[PDB]
């Protein structure tokens, strides 16, 4: 909804959208091959699909091809010092792709603008909009036009046919917050086909164990997830995809006893498998 959109804000007034209370699939985005630049800081691109986070900040803007490396920790330049700054320990990913055939106008595009001059440095995640005309010489400015008084704002002028370093690229930055808080965005969790009447491991909504799953006759209330025994032992689980009650029986085990006479009388021996049906012995 935010990145299929056809409008991307100016860099000095970039659009920030918060993302929370949902599941994020970054692996499918990474596998798709329609983007020309992808890099991350503080995390590797292959692992986002296994992490949980509290908030996601999505920054959207458009910048020229020869400036894409400015969006990085510990960087200096016109964008890094006048338009958009991120901290040295920024944890997230910067992605950028080709939008030359979608964000250009003949004779230079003036719908998109950037800040050329500013009086001070930009703090990380600091957004400023101003219109006082910049002063650079010994002539009054900041409200009056004189000699060498120039607006502290300039336009790229995205022409329809430019070099790769001047074509408009849509740049999206995902900022990540590892703060201690209940997670709201996580990678999608996957489930496999259920198998019953066999000794098989299970991981039911974080309840992990080993045993045999059978159809049960118990009747949970419609809020309980798993049952327990008298001695606080897991014995039944409600499946999260069928809402079905499954009894858990520990896999058959027992002692092995070797019944034998004296070794000098005979070497013939017998084996007793305690509390084991003979069908499960082999």
């Amino acid at each position: 909804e935010v990145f299929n959109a056809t409008r991307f804000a100016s860099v000095y007034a970039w659009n920030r959208k918060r993302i929370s209370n949902c599941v994020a699939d970054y692996s499918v985005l990474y596998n798709s091959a329609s983007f020309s630049t992808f890099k991350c800081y503080g995390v590797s691109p292959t692992k986002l699909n296994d992490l949980c986070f509290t908030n996601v900040y999505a920054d959207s803007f458009v910048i020229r091809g020869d400036e894409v490396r400015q969006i990085a920790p510990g960087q200096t330049g016109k964008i890094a010092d006048y338009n958009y700054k991120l901290p040295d320990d920024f944890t997230g990913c910067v992605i950028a792709w080709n939008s030359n055939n979608l964000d250009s106008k003949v004779g230079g595009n003036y719908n998109y603008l950037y800040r050329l001059f500013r009086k001070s440095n930009l703090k990380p995640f600091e957004r400023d909009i101003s219109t006082e005309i910049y002063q650079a010489g010994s002539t009054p400015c900041n409200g009056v036009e004189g000699f060498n008084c120039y607006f502290p704002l300039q336009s790229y002028g995205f022409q329809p046919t430019n070099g790769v370093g001047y074509q408009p690229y849509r740049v999206v930055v995902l900022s990540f917050e590892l703060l201690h808080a209940p997670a709201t965005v996580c990678g999608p969790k996957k489930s496999t086909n259920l198998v019953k009447n066999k000794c098989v491991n299970f991981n039911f909504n974080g309840l992990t164990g080993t045993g045999v799953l059978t159809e049960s006759n118990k009747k949970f209330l419609p809020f309980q997830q798993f049952g327990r025994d008298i001695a606080d032992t897991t014995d039944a689980v409600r499946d999260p995809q069928t809402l079905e009650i499954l009894d858990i029986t520990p896999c058959s085990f027992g002692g092995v006893s070797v019944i034998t006479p004296g070794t000098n009388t005979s070497n013939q021996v017998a084996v007793l498998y305690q509390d084991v049906n003979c069908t499960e012995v082999p």
Partner: antibody
Amino acid sequence: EVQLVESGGGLVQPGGSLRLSCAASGFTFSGYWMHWVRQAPGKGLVWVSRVNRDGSDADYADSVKGRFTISKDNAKNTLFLQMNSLRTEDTAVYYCVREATTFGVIIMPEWYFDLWGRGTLVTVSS
Amino acid sequence: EIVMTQSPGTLSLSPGERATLSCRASQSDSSNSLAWYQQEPGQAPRLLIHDASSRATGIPDRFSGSGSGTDFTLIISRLEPEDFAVYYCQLYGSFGQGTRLEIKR
């Protein structure tokens, strides 16, 4: 099937105004970027304009800048091209053509036309 | 901005002998993004070739050409009495003047 029906056009004095419409049926009209082109009598096809999926961004050609406006509502399912201050050299037959959208992670228009509708003749003279 | 000049302006050919059509682009940064069309004088242009290499559905195997750089050439293997039409090239923001094919006599 899938066709585009052109409506409007005809005789009009120079310096007037006119409205052209392209009704669509058989395909999801909102999700495809749209194009307008024209063909002069006995001459090659000349491109006119673009429009986005929502219908707010256009890049009207140098021949048609300032006096041509293109609009695309998604509910009524039709495309509009309004012309003002028409001049004599614009006597032609107008077509409306789609733009191939891949429907992928990015819509990513391919700058190509796949279907050509049955257009109308517009004539400007005194 | 881009100009697509098509050469030759008018090509005359027998109903069976083959030929080629060449197009020159002013600014060759298309990266093999090109389209070809064949339009009879009395009906709408029909699509022939996409990406200057592959053919679309319904196009006969005869229509097959390839080109790189500013010189984009489209080849036609054999001829039938249907080439009495105008061939048009297409970039994203430009078009060709058109080349007409005439049966010799």
